[PDB]
């Protein structure tokens, strides 16, 4: 009966919007849906055996003119190997490095802030690693609906082949990839518009076999609360 609980139904496939940046320049954007998640790879000839939809980062020669940057980006892509795998399991987003390119992740804004912040951690190689929990996200989302100020962050940013930009802008980095589960973007936006001049608003979760929902502010909050109770916490 709770239409938001479709998000956690076994077999459901979230849409992941993947945006790649070469030195602060957008060079790639694609939305994928896959049960085994995705894998950010460096070439078309990778390794089919590894599960997950292969997301091939483009050759810098198609977008860049800096020969020095092109060479360094090409070396990063060629060392990606198996690549960076991102998949979903329940209320968690998991990440694992399958190549030799150290990758550092962080949950941040839709656009990486001019100021900076730092990494939330390094993507592990020899084992799995959680990079996002839907649990605390909805809890913050509910708190946000209650007008407590700050919307929850949902944009996963990955720094590939280099350490995280702490003492330098993110635009200096060779390969920066943003991955946004479009359902989270939709949820936040629905919360944002929820407290405005309209009885009902439309939210589209952009997940498999989902229809656009038209809810009032209070029943959207109610659905959020019920979704929370059904989720796991320590």
């Amino acid at each position: 009966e709770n239409p938001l609980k479709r998000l956690l139904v076994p077999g459901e496939e979230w849409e992941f919007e993947v945006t790649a940046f070469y030195r602060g320049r957008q060079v790639f954007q694609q939305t994928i849906s896959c049960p085994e998640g995705l894998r950010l790879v460096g070439s078309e000839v990778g390794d089919r055996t590894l599960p997950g939809w292969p997301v091939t980062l483009p050759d810098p020669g198609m977008s860049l003119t800096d020969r020095g940057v092109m060479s360094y980006v090409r070396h990063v892509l060629s060392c990606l190997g198996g690549g960076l795998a991102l998949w979903r399991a329940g209320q968690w987003l998991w990440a694992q490095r399958l190549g030799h390119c150290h990758t550092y992740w962080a949950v941040s804004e839709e656009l990486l802030p001019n100021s900076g912040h730092g990494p939330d951690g390094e993507v592990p190689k020899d084992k799995e690693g959680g990079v996002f929990d839907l649990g605390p996200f909805i809890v913050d989302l509910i708190t946000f609906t209650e007008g407590s100020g700050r919307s929850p962050r949902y944009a996963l940013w990955f720094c590939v082949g280099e350490s995280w930009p702490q003492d330098q802008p993110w635009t200096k980095r060779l390969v920066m990839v943003k991955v946004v589960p479009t359902c989270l973007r939709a949820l936040v936006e629905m919360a944002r518009v929820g407290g405005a001049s309209s009885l009902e608003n439309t939210v589209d979760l952009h997940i498999s076999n989902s229809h656009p929902l038209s809810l009032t502010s209070d029943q959207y909050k109610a659905y959020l609360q019920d979704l929370v109770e059904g989720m796991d916490f320590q």
């Binding site: 360094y72 070396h75 060392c79 030799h100 150290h102 082949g161 280099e162 350490s163």
Partner: peptide
């Protein structure tokens, strides 16, 4: 160029 300075890439092995 040359070497690739200040990259976070572990040595190759297969």
């Amino acid at each position: 160029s040359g070497c690739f300075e200040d990259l976070a890439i572990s040595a190759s092995t297969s």
